[PDB]
Amino acid sequence: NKETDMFFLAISMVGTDFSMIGQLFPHRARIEIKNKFKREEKTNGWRIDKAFQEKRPFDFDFFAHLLQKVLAEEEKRK
Amino acid sequence: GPSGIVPQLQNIVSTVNLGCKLDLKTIALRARNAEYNPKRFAAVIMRIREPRTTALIFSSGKMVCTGAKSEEQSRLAARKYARVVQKLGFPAKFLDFKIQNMVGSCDVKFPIRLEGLVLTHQQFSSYEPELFPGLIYRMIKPRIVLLIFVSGKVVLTGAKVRAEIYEAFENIYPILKG
């Protein structure tokens, strides 16, 4: 669930763009992200539309740290 | 005559010249939508949903876009990326828009025995059931390449307008029937 939320969130920050999220995701390839998008477009189209109208910024720093903290939290809680 | 089923277009391919130099690293730094993986390839690939399309940009100032269901939709998406690049801080222009390719598909709702087609059409139809399950046919008028399957569904590609797809469809339809 968390990974899906973050895939969405990055799709809003880095757009419908996959190689960079694969790069920042420790263990995801671009084909993986493309497949996530195929699977999710059928149901979450409205959220992906929410992904292209707000101008909140993107980073490595604030984000890289946010990724690592939420992944550690999820792994310790899962 | 027509069987009552129209060929629906599945894809559109188009390109336009941006007319200026761009820095891919700058785009990846600023735009909320960008790649730059020079270790694999030095380019930036876009995509938007309205229209549903994917575009790709270079430092050389060219754009290639694809994914729409209609040519006008493809042009709309192209102009959207042109607007994005213009507001990215680049002096982009929407110059020399050209449509490259489109894909369509249809069906005939009756089974297709590929063996007869290859036996009567081998000179332009290539049948090889070992690697590619379907049958390959290349058409001259217009320059269309066609894929045919037992289920009766057909994939059409290589055109520039939907009229070519329809005309090739009705050219082949009597052959498909018998």
UniProtKB/Swiss-Prot annotation, chain A:
Domain of life of the native organism: Eukaryota
Induction notes from the record: By Epstein-Barr virus (EBV) resulting in the stimulation of the EBV EBER genes.
Tissue: Isoform 2 is highly expressed in cerebellum.
Domain Myb-like, first and last residues per copy: 1-41
Compartment annotation: Nucleus
UniProt modification remark: Phosphorylated by CSNK2A1 during mitosis, resulting in its release from chromatin and suppression of polymerase III transcription.
Function, as annotated: General activator of RNA polymerase III transcription. Requires for transcription from all three types of polymerase III promoters. Requires for transcription of genes with internal promoter elements and with promoter elements upstream of the initiation site.
Record disease entry: Deafness, autosomal recessive, 112: A form of non-syndromic, sensorineural deafness characterized by postlingual progressive hearing impairment. Sensorineural deafness results from damage to the neural receptors of the inner ear, the nerve pathways to the brain, or the area of the brain that receives sound information.
Assembly, per entry: Component of TFIIIB complex. The TFIIIB complex has two activities, alpha and beta. The TFIIIB-alpha and TFIIIB-beta activities are required for transcription of genes with TFIIIC-bound internal promoters and PSE transcription factor-bound external promoters, respectively. The TFIIIB-alpha activity complex is composed of TBP, BDP1, and a complex containing both BRF2 and at least four stably associated proteins; YY1 facilitates the formation of TFIIIB-alpha activity complex. The TFIIIB-beta activity complex is composed of TBP, BDP1, and BRF1.
Protein's name in the database: Transcription factor TFIIIB component B'' homolog
Taxon lineage: Eukaryota, Metazoa, Chordata, Craniata, Vertebrata
Parent sequence residues shown: 305 to 382 of 2624
From Swiss-Prot, chain B:
Record's keyword annotation contains Repeat: yes
Sequence repeats: 9-85, 99-176
Superkingdom of the source species: Eukaryota
Record keywords, A-Z: Disease variant, DNA-binding, Host-virus interaction, Neurodegeneration, Nucleus, Repeat, Spinocerebellar ataxia, Transcription, Transcription regulation
Entry comment describing in which tissues the protein is expressed: Widely expressed, with levels highest in the testis and ovary.
Annotated compartments: Nucleus
GO CC annotation terms, alphabetical: chromatin; cytosol; euchromatin; female germ cell nucleus; female pronucleus; male germ cell nucleus; male pronucleus; nucleoplasm
Assembly information from the UniProt record: Binds DNA as monomer. Component of the TFIID basal transcription factor complex, composed of TATA-box-binding protein TBP, and a number of TBP-associated factors (TAFs), including TAF1, TAF2, TAF3, TAF4, TAF5, TAF6, TAF7, TAF8, TAF9, TAF10, TAF11, TAF12 and TAF13. Part of a TFIID-containing RNA polymerase II pre-initiation complex that is composed of TBP and at least GTF2A1, GTF2A2, GTF2E1, GTF2E2, GTF2F1, GTF2H2, GTF2H3, GTF2H4, GTF2H5, GTF2B, TCEA1, ERCC2, ERCC3, TAF1, TAF2, TAF3, TAF4, TAF5, TAF6, TAF7, TAF8, TAF9, TAF10, TAF11, TAF12 and TAF13. (Microbial infection) Interacts with HIV-1 Tat.
Family: Belongs to the TBP family.
Functional note: The TFIID basal transcription factor complex plays a major role in the initiation of RNA polymerase II (Pol II)-dependent transcription. TFIID recognizes and binds promoters with or without a TATA box via its subunit TBP, a TATA-box-binding protein, and promotes assembly of the pre-initiation complex (PIC). The TFIID complex consists of TBP and TBP-associated factors (TAFs), including TAF1, TAF2, TAF3, TAF4, TAF5, TAF6, TAF7, TAF8, TAF9, TAF10, TAF11, TAF12 and TAF13. The TFIID complex structure can be divided into 3 modules TFIID-A, TFIID-B, and TFIID-C.
Protein name: TATA-box-binding protein
Gene: TBP
Included stretch of the parent chain: 159 to 334 of 339
